[PDB]
Structure 1
Amino acid sequence: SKKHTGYVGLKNTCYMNSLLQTLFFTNQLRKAVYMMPTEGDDSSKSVPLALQRVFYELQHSDKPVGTKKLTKSFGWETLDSFMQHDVQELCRVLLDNVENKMKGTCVEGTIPKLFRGKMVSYIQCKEVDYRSDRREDYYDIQLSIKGKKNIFESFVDYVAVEQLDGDNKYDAGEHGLQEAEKGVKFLTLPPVLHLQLMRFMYDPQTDQNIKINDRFEFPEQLPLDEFLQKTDPKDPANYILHAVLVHSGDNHGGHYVVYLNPKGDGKWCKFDDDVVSRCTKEEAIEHNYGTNAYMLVYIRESKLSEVLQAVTDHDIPQQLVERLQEEKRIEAQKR
């Protein structure tokens, strides 16, 4: 309900309602979503326009906001379509559509501005002079949590140098089968940091994946300078916790909640589909360790004013407002 919390819920679609709120309260994205030139797009088919509708209605409605038009636009209507994919794949499906629509426009490069970081995957031979680098972009990170107490330990394990010895030695081609060091190194961390946590793993004796219900800790403030190669004293890599996406119950079904800190000000709310309610820091952060938190969103402190900048009704263009109201006037009177 809007009167208690300030915010409205979504109506049921497993992990989408959790992600849509998370992307909506990324205010700099929301503004750019409104500036997409969707006037010459079809209503039923356009994913850009459907996300504009949800964002419009989440900003403006007092009642809960529908997602049926958005599901129909990218074809994930049934339950089995949601089950096959993960949250990062859904996030990639939404944000790629938004990025491609924003190309050749005033708000181009907004997705990579907010979400795209850079890393180097490297292989160094120990006893011969051969190094092999690849610069990769990333929009999300998938962190390991099995045998890891916290995020710091998971980032250590992410960047940990694997040795290649004995059986598994590096094929250097001309130099031959060589002993070597494999690792990954973060070059930059983006303003909005989507961190998924590896709650599933492969168990050999059952021929099937199984859930990890272990206690995993994550802080409100997250320093990550030690995980970057070349730090910046003018811009430290200190990250404020923004959202926590949570699962409960069994796998084939269950319940899907997101906790959120929409202004970056420690004032937490639980978004349980249609019922949005206030909650403590401890219900959002501490109590969702081990029920399992599966994705976390961190915003960079230096970029927090820009990322969570104030949206107004003036930031939605007139043609889009006129379009979405003309739908709602026709959609009401139909009986």
Structure 2
Amino acid sequence: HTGYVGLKNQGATCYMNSLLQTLFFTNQLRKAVYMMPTEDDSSKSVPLALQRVFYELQHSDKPVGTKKLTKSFGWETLDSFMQHDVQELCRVLLDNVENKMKGTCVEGTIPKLFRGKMVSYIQCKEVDYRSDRREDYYDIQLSIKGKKNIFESFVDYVAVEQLDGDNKYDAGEHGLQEAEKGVKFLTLPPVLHLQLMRFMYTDQNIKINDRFEFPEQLPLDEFLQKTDPKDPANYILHAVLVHSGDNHGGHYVVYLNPKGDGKWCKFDDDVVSRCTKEEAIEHNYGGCTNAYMLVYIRESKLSEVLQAVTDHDIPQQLVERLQEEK
């Protein structure tokens, strides 16, 4: 019906399935996972489990299982029934895979896809003291409360703040000092992972379901230190990881236009279904159910990142290993 297969819900693994489809259709990543040497102890290797799930979503015509992948985490069956945060998984799973790609033909793939660099400028206001900090990121936490849309939320992110009072800057020989702090992006990665801060702390964790609009095309040149007139930082919406429920618990699905062509499907665990743009974007603006994570791909790299993957990208040794496993 859709051309794409879903993933079985072991019980509470909606987070994993939605993340897995998200990474699965990051084609360039899947290409590199297939190329990882798992020639690796069965059902102990997260890479081997990731190749198995990726192979199966690419070949099966029935919903695919994730039992061996949770086994390779070290988990007992009970853990497949504890609900989790998709961005927390994403941080841990990509880190694990990144380290496991070191020393291989595909070292550096995850940072090439996902890693950018921030800069933070600090300027004392009553003394001549400036300082500098450049840090790599793999995702961006974007504030939501009081912000209408993603654009205002980048504007706020780059806005100057006063480091004053209990937050005075430790300016060295000048001791604590009032200062201004400002952040800018040095680079933006080809695949952009945005985490919307849909939470605030009655002493409880409360989900923010307020309306937050996000676009199909996102111009980000305004939030770079130096713009490249060659490769403008224009991004195309690829995925909407949607969370429904409260902070205690809920459900995850993800909407994706796999080819970046504007043709959208919805992935609710075992069921994939075509949907409209209106249903993937505007209906997830919030205002129970709303966008939590957004995946944008840089327009200049859409062709490469979403390059079509076929059976010539799966090594035969793995095809033998996976099939000769019964």
The alignment's TM-score, normalised by the length of structure 2, stands at 0.94
- Give 1:293 shift: 0.9
Most deviating of 276-285 and 97-106: 97-106
What is the rounded CA distance, in whole Å, between the counterparts of 2:46 and 2:194 in structure 1?
Answer: 24
Give the distance between the partners of 2:99 and 2:245, measured in 1 at CA.
37
DSSP 3-state at the match of 2:82:
helix
Q: Where in structure 1 are there 5+ consecutive unaligned residues?
A: 328-334
CA–CA separation in structure 1 for the residues paired with 2:15 and 2:263:
23
**How far 1:97 moved relative to its partner?**
2.3
Note the C-alpha offset of 1:250: 4.1
Q: 1:25 and 2:29 equivalent?
A: no
Q: What's the CA shift for 1:74?
A: 1.2
Per-residue deviation at 1:251? Answer: 4.1
Q: d(CA) in 2 for partners of 1:121 and 1:85? A: 32
Partner-residue secondary structure (3-state), 2:225: coil
116-125 or 165-174, larger mean C-alpha shift: 165-174
- Which deviates more, 125-134 or 188-197? 125-134
CA contact (8 A) 2:14 2:269 kept: no
Change (3 A) 1:186 1:286: same
**Post-superposition shift, 1:104?**
1.7
**Unpaired segments ≥5 residues, structure 2:** none
Shift of 1:255: 2.2
Deviation at 1:83, TM superposition (A): 5.7
Q: Secondary structure at the residue paired with 2:174?
A: coil
Q: Which residue of 1 aligns with 2:284?
A: 288
Contact 2:206/2:246 (<8 A) preserved: no
Distance 2:184 2:259 in 1: 31
Instruction: Point out the more displaced range, 299-308 or 114-123.
Output: 114-123
Distance 1:147 1:320, change over 3 A: same
* Alignment correspondent of 1:332: none
Judged with a 3 Å threshold, the aligned counterparts in structure 2 of structure 1 residues 244 and 200 are, in CA distance, closer, same or farther, namely same
**Shift in CA distance, 32/184, structure 1 to aligned 2, threshold 3 Å:** same
Contact 2:125 2:179 in 1 (8 A): yes
CA contact (8 A) 1:76 1:82 kept: no
Q: TM-score, normalization: structure 1?
A: 0.91
For residues 127 and 255 of structure 1, the distance between their equivalents in structure 2, rounded to whole angstroms, comes to 51
- State the superposition RMSD in angstroms: 1.8
Q: Distance in 1 between matches of 2:78 and 2:193?
A: 24
What is the rounded CA distance, in whole Å, between the counterparts of 1:243 and 1:35 in structure 2? 24
Q: Deviations over 1:195-244 (max 9, x none)?
A: 01011111xxx122111110110000000000001000000000000000
Name the CA shift for 1:208/1:161 in 2 (closer, same or farther; >3 Å): same
* CA spacing shift, 1:178–1:83, aligned 2, 3 Å: farther
What's the offset of the Cα at 1:79?
6.4
Aligned partners of 1:216, 1:83: CA distance in 2, in Å?
28
Q: Report Cα offsets for 1:20-52 as digits up to 9, x if no partner.
A: 00000000000000000001x011110000000
How many residues get paired?
320
Q: Given the superposition, is the C-alpha separation of residues 232 and 251 from structure 1 closer, same or farther in structure 2, using an over 3 Å criterion?
A: same
Cα offset, 1:85, TM superposition: 5.7
CA contact (8 A) 1:164 1:182 kept: yes
List aligned pairs for 1:98-137, cutoff 5 A. 98-137=97-136
Kept in 2: contact 1:14–1:82 (CA 8 A)? no
**Within 2, Cα distance between the matches of 1:169 and 1:97?**
37
Sort the Cα spacing of 1:177 and 1:264 in 2 relative to 1 into closer, same or farther, 3 A. Answer: same
SS of 2:61's equivalent in the other structure is coil
Q: Distance in 2 between matches of 1:20 and 1:51?
A: 9
Distance 1:82 1:76, change over 3 A: farther
